[PDB]
């Protein structure tokens, strides 16, 4: 191609999206936004294929013009808005909230969420830097750019952010024996507490994690996402608690 493409095949979609082969040749190519391409979800696939409330693009389009849903308080009117993991979805006329969070089945997962939990949101600080005029700041995993954070925080760090001000509620460091979500990889969604971290200078650092059934596995730090302390999640968790069984 002599540039980017506007087109997305049916089979070209990520497998976790659970979209059939037969009701289309095309998947809706998601627009650019916070998250990256394969670990997102368009809102129309969210609504029609999970919430089932609309069945057509004209329907969901009319809804977006009806200005209902606010993602983190902000409405989008984009159909293919790239909604990713750990997201707050606010439903006014139905009076609900939804945390978008990975499935034990490796898929995504809606979560029925109250207003107090929707008031804030979580974020993996991925890069702390020093900006122009010597201003210190961070960029999270969801692309939130926050000036002037607490100096004790470093990269990859879990931060509770109030959405209502878009401000740093509090933070959680990266220690062993912290409750961690795994975002990507084969074992994603399997919530566990970190055993430790095999570190490599310049290399992909591996992480050993043990979960409640005393089961240990190893993923990469990119998949690693700390939630909270032991028995202390800052969020409400869905059924199964991220536990793989037979």
């Amino acid at each position: 191609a002599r540039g980017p493409k506007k087109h997305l095949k049916r089979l070209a979609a990520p497998h976790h999206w659970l979209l059939d082969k037969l009701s289309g040749c095309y998947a809706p190519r998601p627009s650019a936004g916070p998250h990256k391409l394969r670990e997102s979800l368009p809102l129309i696939v969210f609504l029609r294929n999970r919430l089932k409330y609309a069945l057509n693009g004209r329907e969901v389009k009319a809804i977006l013009m009806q200005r209902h849903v606010k993602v983190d308080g902000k409405v989008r009117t984009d159909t293919t808005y790239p909604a990713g993991f750990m997201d707050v979805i606010t439903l006014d006329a139905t009076n609900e909230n939804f945390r978008l969070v990975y499935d034990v089945k490796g898929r995504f997962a809606v979560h029925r969420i109250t207003d107090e939990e929707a008031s804030y949101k979580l974020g993996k600080v991925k890069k702390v830097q020093l900006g122009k005029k010597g201003v210190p700041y961070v960029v999270t995993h969801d692309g939130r750019t926050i000036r002037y954070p607490d100096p004790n925080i470093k990269v990859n760090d879990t931060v509770k952010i109030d959405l209502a001000s878009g401000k740093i509620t509090d933070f959680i460091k990266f220690d062993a024996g912290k409750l961690v979500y795994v975002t990507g990889g084969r074992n994603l969604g399997r919530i566990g507490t970190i055993v430790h971290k095999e570190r490599h200078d310049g290399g992909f650092d591996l992480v050993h994690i043990k979960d409640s059934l005393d089961n240990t596995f190893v993923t990469r730090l990119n998949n690693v996402f700390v939630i909270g302390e032991q028995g202390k999640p800052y969020i409400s968790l869905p059924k199964g608690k991220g536990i793989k069984l037979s």
């Binding site: 013009m65 006014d92 006329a93 139905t94 009076n95």
Partner: protein, 224 residues
């Protein structure tokens, strides 16, 4: 110049002031297959199950929990009359628009069921209602304006005879909102009391009109 030549698209922008200018009240100049007018178990209960189907707002769901525990019949209305009305006005001053449409509808059918004995509730209901109108003016909802004044015309149609006997007091209950310095508020209240005026009989007409004359010379300053 307003919009006289309708374009082809299905969706006009339709600003709030234009909505206000197009809005009218009278359901008799309207009509429909009203559910309370359609099934005749109880009007309040019919409207309540209808809005229990329709509305999904947390204010109204807590309200509906309490009231669907309380009342399931017309003797239960006649028994727990006060408590359900106090919970009504509680959520009414809890001020949720999503619950404000169905709660106003249940207020209307609650008066339609409780007619002749409602007036004691109905007076401070007028008070809280005009407070809610001022709250909508702080807000910006032609829908809420429409719901409130439709409820007002409903209560007038339901309780006409006692109010055409006691007409000049009902005027006094709305005079601060008739003399309120908003032309469309005055217009809507004028439409509702105008329905009542066209309903009222001749003796009460002459009495009420003469008292309006003296009220005019009292408020000789006001032009609204």
């Amino acid at each position: 110049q307003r919009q006289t030549t309708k374009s082809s698209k299905r969706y006009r922008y339709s600003s709030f002031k234009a909505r206000i200018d197009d809005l009218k009240i009278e359901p008799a100049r309207n009509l429909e297959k009203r559910v309370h007018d359609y099934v005749e178990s109880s009007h309040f209960l019919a409207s309540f199950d209808q809005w229990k189907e329709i509305n999904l707002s947390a204010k109204f769901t807590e309200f509906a929990a309490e009231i669907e525990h309380d009342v399931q019949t017309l003797p239960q209305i006649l028994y727990h009359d006060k408590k359900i009305f106090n919970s009504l006005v509680s959520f009414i001053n809890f001020h949720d628009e999503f619950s404000l449409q169905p709660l106003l509808d249940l207020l209307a059918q609650f008066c339609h069921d409780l007619g002749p004995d409602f007036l004691k509730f109905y007076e401070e209901a007028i008070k809280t209602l005009i407070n809610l109108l001022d709250a909508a003016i702080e807000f910006e909802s032609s829908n809420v304006f429409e719901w409130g004044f439709n409820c007002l015309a409903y209560i007038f149609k339901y309780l006409s005879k006692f109010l055409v006997k006691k007409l000049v007091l009902t005027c006094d209950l709305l005079i601060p909102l008739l003399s309120h310095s908003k032309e469309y508020l005055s217009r809507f209240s004028a439409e509702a009391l105008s329905f009542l005026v066209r309903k009222c009989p001749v003796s009460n007409l002459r009495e009420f009109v003469r008292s309006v004359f003296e009220k005019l010379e009292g408020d000789d300053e006001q032009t609204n």
